[PDB]
Design a protein around this ligand. Structure first.
Ligand SMILES: Nc1ncnc2c1ncn2[C@@H]1O[C@H](COP(=O)(O)OP(=O)(O)O)[C@@H](O)[C@H]1O
Ligand SMILES: Nc1ncnc2c1ncn2[C@@H]1O[C@H](COP(=O)(O)OP(=O)(O)O)[C@@H](O)[C@H]1O
Ligand code: BEF
Ligand code: BEF
Ligand SMILES: [Mg+2]
Ligand SMILES: [Mg+2]
Lengths: 624, 624
């Protein structure tokens, strides 16, 4: 009554390069399994059980793996396998600050469709907690090395529950009963047998199965250093080894006797090669005793598996954005000191600059104070944004595992990550603008304050987007901080406030127009000097910091009369020598309006999110 | 013939706070074990087996744990347990880029003394690889999620081999046979039984022991939600449960039947409390049927355990510095792109500044170019040093595990970390100095170049030491980058090149003298302007960037005669108006010599290494 599926794999061969020689990890491994059955992979530690499951689960790179994997006779595509399969790896990889039932509820919201209501998604998480036996750990965090949460065997069954909350057609489990006691290992294999007999293909590895667990496994494959040495039912184990020449006693464990003989054969002079040839003869000796695949999968969705076209994702992208946003918010509530310290250093930076640059005046040094305040404020904004570099990098391995089997789109991840960080950028922009606008004494009134909040927000948005893009380009957090800090220094050097645009060499002026700091710095200057007739050098301040010494006030008026004699222009003591428009001409802030400078800063932020998404399309897979 | 040891623990009680209610993780757990025996801890997943071993291994915090742990009747001190014991945790935590035999050789060099030669340390690693059964994985890296190395069961026995290469008196193993096949689990317990019968106390947890493994265990303790439900020999297990009321059949597994009944009792109305009271009665019926501890430990060292005073560390601190330096060098050879990209961004920063600030001249703008070059060069040096923040943070959990049982002193770690990073700081200082000294055209000749290399090196040394100190203060890499970037900005703001020392407010001048950038920036300025009569403003450059417009050359001489009329001083066209000594007076670089400025920069680096060491003395323990 379930839809029949036959997963077949033939001649699987995998080689790695010793780093320059070659080592064969899988050697000509064939086998098959049907729905309704559990195929168990056995063998010693290091025999290739994780490699054989990595080959079948589209986890080793194309071109590296030889041989063919089919489903119902037709080639099992990598695009189809992400839709219908799930993989519980040998190691657990969970978000540490979420609890057990929060973790299983996020995976239920990723993998179950909108046709199932939220009350019935919660009933499936509660029923999965009860039958996996982790009720006592349900409100406990996962934890990590620094934070104690659940036990190791409890973390194991959370990883099983992440991938069995929906009902996939193919299920790969790398050692699901490792770290489990004998009665909870039996509970897990009874759960996996129920999923099997509902119409699934189960392929699992297992190390020390008891006679209770081994009776639930329908097919066994024994590995020995990448070779198959046994394939068949558990009941055919005494009949196999009696034909090989080493019969099993009735009082000993049959899998314990098998791996004892196999390890002894590994140390022999002739190897396991006599057993490998004998197993090939044993498989050839037992061969002497309509609906296409996309239709059979769609007929299986109609029966209840993977809860008619086959959608690659269970939910629309906006349902996935809503789920990914709530998990990022929940990871931020559990570590409140991350946003709390980012808010604290921005407020302290604003308070320090408020006391240092207190109520700047219309003077020649009040201009250089304004230019140096805005250069410092814009520069620490972009350097603050470098703390966003480990955000993707500590999520990246979990992101690779979840997107390998279509829990959410990678576009939904980029959209959700840009949405969750934006309320904190608003709080940092408001905290910096209210501590510095009225205390430094910036111009514009209320509309000048409003533009000031907007261009700080665009700076944080542009800077975070660029640091996010470089986090998707580098693999390493230390490589990334070396590169971000260097490029942010080059954005500062060619911004226009270290050296002017007229002094930048011609072969560097392309990088001046790609400076991320240039356009918000040019926007706060036009917001500050927005009165084109406001006087900044009244004409006795012509000799403020000239290389003549310090001069008396009456003799500075002697020079004002004397320099009037030689240039023609009459400079009295109240003649304005530099207006707000003159400051913007000397700094070179003349090309764009402050609104176009704000628009370019917003547009750089959108460009780098798209480039980060394109880097998630080309890279960030964890193959082999 | 081995020295007798009796480890006894009584009334162990541990409570955690649900985060506000309280949960009892260990409840009145007593028991004892002797040398020559293996005490096995059994129970379901989540019953407290890791917590019971964490209590005995001095791993949960003092005050949190109640009850007493003794050794030969005397209280097992935390200072003595670090010397005589070792702990294999449930999770593996190894350096991923080292191979298997490199990892075991570093642990042999940490734990075996100088009286054992290096040839005999290598023979003990080769013999440990053979009897743990990991010969095939010996030249393979450990790996991590991103880099495929050894298998999971191979990584397990590396973690066992790290703590059994020396022969400790007490050995705690949290699930050593998890992830292991049945024949290599038997090989590990036979190795642990050999260590036991040479005079060690073995306390291990185990989940699914076969009848082969269970015959090697002398004492069992069964846990059920923090309570002891069984203590005794494996042979007394059918006699125990026949007296409780549920006898065991002779054809079933005795530990499988026990945990089946215990889990059924957990779901009953009355709980396991009848079994917990029955086990207390069962222990009381079996009570009816000279050399002090420091002398007994010293008599055990002379027998060969922990290969007469008892040294807290196997090696002198300079042997530990030599071992820790080689492991850091080996981790850097395996990731050459870390140093390669740090060298590349420094060379590129030096090349960019060489083309931008090419061969600066004696002009008023050539002074501001020199001041802005040196401000930029010193600032990117300290911001480059922020990439040292994850160096301790990705090593910290391994550092906590190794120093918890005295593999090396924490002082040796601080000394080795300051020694390994110093050759790379020399290469970065030489790369920046040769790309910028001759191209920007700095003064001094060869001795000015030599001081220039020294003050860049002192800047890198001072900046790295401070970022290292802040890495020991924060727990998080994102918290640390938020704090380092903010404080490096405050060092820049109060350095003296954004605003002068005369313009810094009086309530901030204490922080100006604590600015790390101030003293190397003041040292390169006195190296540059080291000729006190070198002319930078000749007397036609008095009106270079004055607010008068651009002026013809003949009419600037009209002003020079006109400004000579009003001040008395005759300023001709060749009259020097600003010397190199005048530039240093205007910038405020007058207090210290450039050699004392270099000495303070070196001294700040030594201060922050000491403060990082003091933070490793007070914190960086991973308790509970
Ligand atoms: N990328 C690799 N490079 C070098 N050796 C490898 C690599 N992957 C695996 N080996 C080896 O292949 C063998 C089998 O790998 P694995 O599948 O993880 O074993 P297991 O049977 O425990 O699952 C191991 O000895 C392992 O060290
Ligand atoms: N710090 C903790 N906070 C809350 N619950 C905890 C904490 N530590 C353990 N628990 C719980 O104590 C129980 C036993 O812990 P553990 O010793 O790790 O179990 P195991 O028997 O598998 O070794 C687990 O259910 C675990 O979730
Ligand atoms: F779940 Be515990 F590690 F037995
Ligand atoms: F060592 Be493998 F994980 F069996
Ligand atoms: Mg494996
Ligand atoms: Mg545990």
């Amino acid at each position: 009554r379930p839809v029949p599926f036959v997963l077949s794999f033939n001649n699987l061969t995998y080689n790695v390069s010793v780093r320059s020689k070659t080592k064969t990890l899988l050697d000509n491994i064939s086998g098959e399994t049907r729905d309704g059955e559990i195929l168990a992979v056995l063998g010693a530690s290091g025999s290739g059980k994780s490699t054989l499951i990595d080959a079948l689960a589209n986890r080793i790179a194309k071109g590296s793996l030889k041989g063919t994997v089919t489903l119902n006779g037709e080639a099992l595509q990598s695009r189809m396998l992400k839709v219908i399969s799930a993989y519980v790896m040998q190691d657990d990889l969970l978000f540490p600050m979420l609890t057990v039932e929060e973790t299983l509820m996020f995976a239920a919201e990723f993998r179950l469709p909108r046709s199932l209501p939220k009350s019935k998604k919660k009933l499936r998480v509660q029923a999965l907690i009860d039958q996996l036996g982790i009720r006592n750990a349900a409100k406990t965090i996962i934890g990590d090395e620094g934070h104690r949460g659940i036990s190791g065997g409890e973390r194991r069954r959370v990883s099983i529950g992440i991938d069995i909350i929906h009902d996939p057609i193919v299920l790969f489990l790398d050692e699901p009963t490792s770290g489990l006691d004998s009665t909870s290992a039996f509970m897990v294999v009874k759960v996996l047998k129920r999923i099997a007999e509902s119409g699934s293909i189960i392929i699992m590895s297992i190390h020390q199965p008891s006679h209770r667990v081994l009776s639930l496994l329908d097919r066994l494959i024994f590995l020995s250093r990448g070779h198959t040495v046994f394939s068949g039912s558990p009941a055919s184990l005494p009949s196999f080894f009696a034909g090989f020449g080493n019969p099993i006693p009735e009082n000993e464990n049959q899998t314990e006797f098998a791996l004892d003989l196999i390890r002894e054969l590994e140390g022999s002079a002739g190897g396991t090669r006599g057993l490998v040839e004998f197993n090939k003869k044993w498989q050839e000796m037992k061969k002497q005793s309509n609906l296409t695949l996309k239709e059979a999968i769609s007929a299986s969705i109609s029966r209840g598996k993977l809860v008619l076209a086959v959608p690659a994702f269970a939910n629309p992208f906006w349902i996935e954005i809503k789920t990914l946003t709530r998990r990022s918010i929940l990871n931020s509530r559990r570590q409140p000191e991350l946003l709390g310290m980012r808010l604290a250093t921005v407020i302290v930076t604003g308070f320090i600059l408020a006391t240092v640059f207190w109520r700047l005046d219309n003077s020649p040094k009040g201009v250089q104070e304004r230019l140096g305040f805005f250069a410092f404020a814009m520069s620490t904004m972009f350097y603050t944004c470098a703390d966003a570099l480990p955000v993707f990098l500590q999520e990246r391995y979990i992101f690779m595992r979840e997107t390998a089997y279509n829990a959410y789109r990678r576009s939904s991840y980029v959209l959700s990550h840009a949405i969750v960080t934006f309320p904190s950028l608003i709080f940092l922009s408001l905290a910096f603008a209210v501590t510095t606008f009225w205390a430094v004494g910036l111009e514009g009134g209320l509309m000048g304050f409003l533009f000031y909040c907007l261009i700080i927000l665009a700076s944080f948005w542009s800077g975070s987007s660029f640091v996010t893009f470089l986090s998707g380009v580098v693999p390493h957090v230390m490589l990334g901080y070396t590169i971000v800090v260097a490029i942010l220094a080059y954005f500062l050097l060619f911004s226009g406030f270290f050296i002017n645009r007229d002094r930048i060499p011609q072969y560097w002026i392309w990088f001046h127009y790609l400076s991320l700091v240039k356009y918000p710095y040019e926007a706060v200057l036009q917001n500050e000097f927005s009165d084109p007739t406001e006087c900044f050098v009244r004409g006795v301040q012509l000799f403020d910091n000239s290389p003549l010494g310090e001069l008396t006030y009456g003799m500075k008026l002697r020079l004002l009369d004397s320099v009037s004699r030689s240039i023609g222009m009459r400079i009295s003591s109240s003649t304005c020598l530099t207006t707000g428009a003159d400051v913007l001409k000397q700094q070179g802030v003349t090309q764009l309006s402050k609104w176009n400078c704000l628009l370019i800063t917003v547009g750089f932020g959108f460009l780098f999110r798209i480039l980060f998404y394109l880097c998630l399309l080309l890279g960030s897979k964890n193959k082999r």
